[PDB]
Structure formats: structure tokens, C-alpha cells
């Protein structure tokens, strides 16, 4: 049962869409259907899947696992250390996940994305959008060849966390641990990841918050996405919109 809904009051004037789906009672709530079906770069939301790839291939093993920091200077304080999987995920540390993915052969990544139906599954621009000048701080998942819609994000999240993939339960639980967020409401468990990019072609942001909500037996998989032309709209801003929607409509 697909319900078209109006969450515009929570977007406080920012252009975007939201989809919340409960796979038990098959209830899909959609705000801005056209946007929810449009494929865009996942940006840092891809760290959800990249974490599972690294765990499955043995590049990392636990939420403590390290990737061998080499001393490179970065402006984010917390990137300048041999950080663990759990801290790299929470700090959205690009060098950690770039080094992780570059230890995996392209055919393995292709087959996993194909199995997950991860959007267009297009990893052809492996090294990413090099024309932005950021060099090694780039990859196929960051405003580059790989694109996925908010609906497809929710479908992927649901397949993973309902246990319908071949990923190990141990590895799923590590991901659950590191994605948990504190929304100052103990009656719901929220998990998610932000992402931020700028679509230079269309001059619009790609700002994301993707994840899941558990509340008293029911689970909702969700994706909130802005395509606003205002460059101040970031992943963290869209997460704030997402939490307001959760608190108002899913409590
Ligand atoms: C991922 O989207 N990115 C890595 C890092 N995290 O940003 S987030 O808070 O939106 O997750 C900085 C920006 C972005 C990128 N383009 O590298
Ligand atoms: N980024 C978060 O996790 C958000 C932002 C602030 C706190 C924790 N959280 C909330 O939902 N908060 O708001 S609060 O309930 O009004 O205190």
C-alpha cells in the first residue's frame, strides 16, 4: 500500500523527497515520488555498502579494524590518525574507505552491486570525478559513475538488514552498531548515514540521509534526499529534516 504523503512542513522550504517503507506490513510512504525514483550519486551513503564489502573480503574484520594510516596531512583533525572502522564511518573518513575499496578487485565489487541491485551498478569511473582536482579523495561513488535512487536505497537497506543477502550476520551486526545514532528518544532506534555532493551538471546538491528506524516491533527503511540548488544544504542538514519527520510522523 503506497501512500503519497506531504512532509513539506519538515523540509522548511528545501527541495527534496522522502520514502519510508515497512516491509512487514508492506506500507510505503512517499513524499515527492518523482524525486524518490530519480537516480543520483550516493556519495558517502555508499560507506554502508563499502563497509560490508570490506568485511566480506576480509580487508577489515571488526569495528576496531584499522587501515594503516600513513601520516598524510588532512584538515579534519580526526582523519590524521590510525582510526578504527567505527570512527572512520562516523567521521565519514574518505581516505580510509578509499584505501579499503582499492584493496578489492573490480569484478567482486561489480558482482556484489549486481546482487544488491545497487542502482545502475556502474563502477566504470573507478577512480571517480578527477576533474574536481581532489585526486585520491575521489571514487566511483562520489559524484561519478555510480547512481542510485532513494527508492533503490531503501530496497537495498531492507534486503541487507532483513537478512535477505548472503552477507554474514556478524558483519550486518557490525554495520548496525556503527550506524546507530542518538536522537534523544529511547522509544525508537535510528540508524543511518549522511552523504553530501554537488551535481555540477544540474547545479544541484545531492544531500542524503539513508537508514532505518525501529519502533516497537515495526521497522521502517528510509531515504531522505534533497536536490536543492542552495549549496548550503548538506547531508547533515537533511539528517536533521529526517529526524524531524521521524519524530513527528513515526513516533
Ligand atoms: C560523503 O558524502 N562525503 C565524505 C564526507 N562526509 O560528508 S557527509 O557528512 O555528508 O557524510 C565529506 C563530503 C562528502 C564528499 N563529497 O566527499
Ligand atoms: N544529530 C542528532 O543525533 C540529533 C541532533 C541533536 C539531538 C540529537 N539529535 C536529536 O534529535 N537531537 O535533538 S533533541 O531531541 O531536540 O535534543
CATH number of the domain where residue 225 is located: 3.40.710.10
Cα dist from 131 to 125, 134, 207, 234, whole Å: 12, 8, 21, 21
CA geometry: angle 166, 211, 56, nearest 5 deg: 30
In ligand 1, which atom is closest to the CA atom of 198?
16
Tell me how many helices (H) and strands (E) the chain has: 8, 7
CA geometry: angle 147, 61, 141, nearest 5 deg: 15
Cα dist from 85 to 64, 66, 82, 189, whole Å: 6, 6, 10, 21
In ligand 1, which atom is closest to the CA atom of 92?
6
User: Ligand 1 within 6 A of 144 CB?
Assistant: no
What's this structure's resolution in Å? 1.9
How many other C-beta atoms are found inside a 10 Å radius of the C-beta of residue 203? 9
Distance (angstroms) between ligand 2 centre and the Cα of 83 equals 25
Range of the domain at 15: 2-249
* Method in brief: X-ray
In ligand 2, which atom is closest to the CA atom of 181?
3
Domain count, the chain: 1
Nearest CA to ligand 2 atom 2: 183
Angstrom distance (rounded) from CA 16 to CA 40: 13
Angstrom distance (rounded) from CA 188 to CA 87: 23
What are residue 9's phi and psi, to 5 degrees?
-60, -30
User: Ligand 1 within 6 A of 235 CB?
Assistant: yes
Angstrom distance (rounded) from CA 17 to CA 30: 8
DSSP state of 12: T
- Return the bridge partners of 204, or none: 199
Angstrom distance (rounded) from CA 218 to CA 248: 16
Distance (angstroms) between ligand 1 centre and the Cα of 29 equals 27
Which residues are within 8 A (CB) of 13 and not within 5 positions of it... i.e. 6 or more apart?
none
Distance (angstroms) between ligand 1 centre and the Cα of 236 equals 9
Amino acid at each position: 500500500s503506497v501512500n503519497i504523503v506531504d512532509y513539506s512542513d519538515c523540509f522548511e522550504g528545501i527541495s527534496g523527497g522522502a520514502i519510508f517503507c515497512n516491509t512487514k506490513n508492506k506500507e510505503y510512504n512517499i513524499y515527492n515520488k518523482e524525486l524518490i525514483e530519480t537516480r543520483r550519486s550516493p556519495c558517502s551513503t555508499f560507506k554502508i555498502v563499502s563497509t560490508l564489502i570490506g568485511l566480506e573480503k576480509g580487508v577489515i574484520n571488526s569495528k576496531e579494524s584499522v587501515m594503516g594510516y600513513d601520516g598524510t596531512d588532512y584538515p579534519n583533525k580526526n582523519w590524521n590518525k590510525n582510526l578504527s572502522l567505527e570512527e572512520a564511518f562516523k567521521e565519514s573518513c574518505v581516505w580510509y574507505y578509499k584505501k579499503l575499496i582499492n584493496k578489492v578487485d573490480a569484478k567482486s565489487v561489480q558482482n556484489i552491486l549486481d546482487d544488491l541491485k545497487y542502482g545502475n551498478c556502474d563502477i566504470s569511473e573507478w577512480e571517480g570525478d578527477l576533474k574536481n582536482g581532489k585526486g585520491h579523495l575521489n571514487g566511483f561513488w562520489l559524484e561519478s559513475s555510480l547512481q542510485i535512487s532513494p527508492k533503490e536505497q531503501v530496497q537495498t537497506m531492507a534486503k541487507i538488514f532483513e537478512g535477505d543477502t548472503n552477507f554474514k550476520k556478524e558483519h550486518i551486526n557490525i554495520l548496525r552498531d556503527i550506524m546507530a545514532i542518538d536522537v534523544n528518544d529511547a522509544n525508537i532506534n535510528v540508524y543511518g548515514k549522511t552523504g553530501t555532493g554537488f551535481d555540477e551538471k544540474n547545479k544541484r546538491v545531492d544531500a542524503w540521509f539513508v537508514g532505518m528506524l525501529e519502533r516497537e516491533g515495526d521497522t521502517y527503511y528510509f531515504a531522505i534526499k534533497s536536490d536543492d540548488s542552495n549549496k548550503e544544504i548538506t547531508g547533515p542538514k537533511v539528517k536533521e529534516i529526517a529526524i524531524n519527520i521521524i519524530k513527528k510522523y513515526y513516533s
